[PDB]
Design a protein around this nucleic acid. Structure first.
Length: 242
DNA sequence: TTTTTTCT
DNA sequence: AGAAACAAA
């Protein structure tokens, strides 16, 4: 039921989500690697551009983000659009819908050019603004999957380069996609957006932090490195969702 | 079809 | 709103 899931997620806490994000999450590892090989502004711009083409992949997400990170390390990037025009058609893990994806990057390039270091700090302090602003530049609904996850991925990148932590806003949801629809169906007949926003609000853990916890646990990532109390609560969530 | 999107 | 975009199994 929602109440038991929210209770356990509340005990895991933002602290538990942050532990998984920073120690286990392979997209965070990929971003940390790239953050050492390119300047911080370009790094964040590339992370957002990459999120916006991270749909309908031909590989798992963790394979794709590592491909991205290793490709761009050390590169001299000027136009993000020109860089993706070379990168995407030769990638292994993102071969579908490339013309459409490239046009999204072309459309967002002007907005990306506003991301000075200071503007990045301002958005990390107000990620709801970033969320709305990315959507506005693309002419789309901010509720959409790739706009939400571009904020999530921006949050990882900013945390690394600014060496400080702000939690994701409570108002940014886990958005619908096939995998959250499938998981949620196992647990409830409620629609996912409403279900997970209720759990987020009851637990005190914003939805995007809940997203960090769900997928490693479902995919069998080991929780053994967590200290004993957190480990127990992670193990309790695995019993509910797997 | 199944593993998000544009266009308007 | 919903057809069409594109690769693989």
């Amino acid at each position: 039921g929602s109440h038991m899931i929210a209770r356990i997620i509340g005990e895991i806490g933002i602290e538990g989500a942050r532990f998984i994000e920073e120690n286990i999450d392979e997209q965070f590892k990929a971003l940390r690697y790239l953050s050492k090989g390119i300047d911080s502004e370009t790094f964040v711009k590339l992370v957002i551009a990459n999120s916006l083409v991270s749909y309908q992949l031909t590989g798992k997400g963790e394979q794709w983000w590592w491909e991205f990170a290793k490709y761009f390390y050390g590169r001299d990037v000027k136009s993000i659009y020109l860089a993706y025009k070379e990168f995407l058609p030769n990638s292994r893990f993102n071969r579908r819908l490339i013309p459409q994806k490239l046009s999204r990057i072309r459309r967002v390039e002007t907005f990306l050019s506003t991301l000075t270091e200071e503007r990045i700090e301002e958005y990390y302090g107000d990620m709801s603004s970033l969320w709305g602003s990315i959507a506005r530049a693309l002419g789309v609904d901010k509720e959409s999957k790739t706009v939400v996850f571009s904020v999530k991925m921006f949050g990882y990148a900013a945390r690394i380069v600014l060496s400080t932590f702000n939690p994701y806003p409570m108002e940014i949801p886990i958005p619908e996609d096939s995998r959250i629809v499938k998981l949620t169906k196992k647990l409830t007949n409620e629609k996912p957006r409403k279900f997970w926003m209720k759990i987020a609000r009851e637990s005190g853990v914003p939805p995007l932090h809940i997203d960090s916890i769900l997928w490693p646990l479902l995919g069998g990532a080991s929780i053994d490195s967590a200290p004993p109390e957190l480990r127990d609560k992670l193990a309790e969530l695995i019993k509910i969702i797997r």
